[PDB]
Design a binder for this molecule. Structure first.
Ligand SMILES: *[C@@H]1O[C@H](CO)[C@@H](O[C@H]2O[C@H](CO)[C@@H](O)[C@H](O)[C@H]2NC(C)=O)[C@H](O)[C@H]1NC(C)=O
Length: 361
């Protein structure tokens, strides 16, 4: 089983303990660590933060304590417009140029592969996404001839039924991708003003409207579309989505007036690092959707939907029973990397909870 762990570039700028550098990562923890967001300029992959080469080096030295460890670099992300990806991939000339620029970059900085985070291809992009994966992989095979190890190629895909039908040809890109990561956590997406859990596991059978929103539906679906189990990796979140209530009501359906107030370290609306959530729980009321097997908490006029050690131990357990390739964890930096925020003395409590279940066969 694989344990893919995303690490983000901008977690270095957080104040106090919130700050995080590749330095704090346990090398023996995950199998694959995906460094977050490279960029594109003049049609070639390129750096993003001023000090990326430095940090590239720090992350890639962990492979010195753990040789089994594999690291990849990711291109795209939410704050990277899709029109941008879309326009590189639809002109074979600008496309072929980006591809050729990739292997040497990865090699110079010591990455074992590249990851595509084209955040949401559209109806008009399905065909080019395919071209890009196909051609990119071809380029990696041809390059392994120089007698060095073949660079890995992966992709982070949407888990929303309508998004998968609209922009992905799952059957095709699964042939060329080393693994596929399922973004199974943005379900109660950005819109609608009702309280709800962003990463529920099941249908929460007490809910009738949207069955397409949950890890289970998403997974079954991808399998039907043709992606093979041994390439699928299920996304697990390490952050919580927050709302500012608009009434005394706190149960399913309750009205929302907007996002939740920012975390003291995370500084961003509607979001909360896990270590922040640990502090938050003090004086907070905790509840747990039995149906979807995921917890939520309220305190004041704030309602937080999140994932704890056991809702996570559970998602992990599902993943195994359906025989998938492994689990993907979004942001080791959003977890309690110091281990001084969530009661117990453990470091990376959530990510290691997943690793425990994954390591028991
Ligand atoms: C990522 O690469 C992009 C595209 O190369 C960089 O984009 C910009 O470059 C110019 C100088 O700032 C601007 O005039 C343009 O707005 C812009 N091109 C676009 C958006 O089409 C961008 O700087 C890079 N991002 C970072 C953080 O370096």
């Amino acid at each position: 089983y694989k344990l893919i762990c995303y690490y983000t570039s901008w977690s270095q700028y957080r104040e106090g303990d919130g700050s995080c550098f590749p330095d704090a990562i346990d090398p023996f923890l995950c199998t694959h660590v995906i460094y977050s967001f490279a960029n594109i300029s003049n049609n070639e992959i390129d750096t993003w933060e001023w000090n990326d080469v430095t940090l590239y080096d720090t992350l890639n030295t962990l492979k010195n304590r753990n040789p089994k460890l594999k690291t990849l670099l990711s291109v795209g992300g939410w704050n990277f417009g899709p029109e941008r990806f879309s326009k590189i991939a639809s002109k074979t000339q600008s496309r072929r140029t980006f591809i050729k620029s990739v292997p040497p970059f990865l090699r110079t900085h010591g990455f074992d592969g590249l990851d595509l985070a084209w955040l949401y291809p559209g109806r008009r992009d399905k065909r080019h996404l395919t071209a890009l994966v196909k051609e990119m992989k071809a380029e990696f095979a041809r390059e392994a001839q120089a007698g060095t190890e073949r660079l890995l190629l992966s992709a982070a895909v949407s888990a929303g039924k309508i998004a998968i039908d609209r922009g992905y040809d799952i059957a095709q890109i699964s042939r060329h991708l080393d693994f596929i990561s399922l973004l199974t956590y943005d379900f109660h997406g950005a819109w609608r003003q009702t309280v709800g859990h962003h990463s529920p596991l099941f249908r929460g059978n007490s809910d009738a409207s949207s069955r397409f929103s949950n890890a289970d539906y998403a997974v079954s679906y991808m399998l039907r579309l043709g992606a093979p189990a041994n390439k699928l990796v299920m996304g697990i979140p390490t952050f919580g989505r927050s709302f500012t209530l608009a009434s005394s009501k706190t149960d399913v359906g309750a009205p929302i007036s907007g996002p939740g107030i920012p975390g003291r370290f995370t500084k961003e609306k509607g979001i909360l690092a896990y270590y922040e959530i640990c502090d938050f729980l003090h004086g907070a009321t905790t509840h747990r959707f039995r149906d979807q097997q995921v917890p939520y908490a309220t305190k004041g006029n704030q309602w937080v939907a999140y994932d704890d050690q056991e809702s996570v131990k559970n998602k992990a357990r599902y993943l195994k029973n359906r025989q998938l390739a492994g689990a993907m964890v979004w942001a080791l930096d959003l977890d309690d990397f110091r281990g001084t925020f969530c009661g117990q003395n453990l470091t990376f409590p959530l990510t290691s909870a997943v690793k425990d279940v994954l390591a028991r066969v």
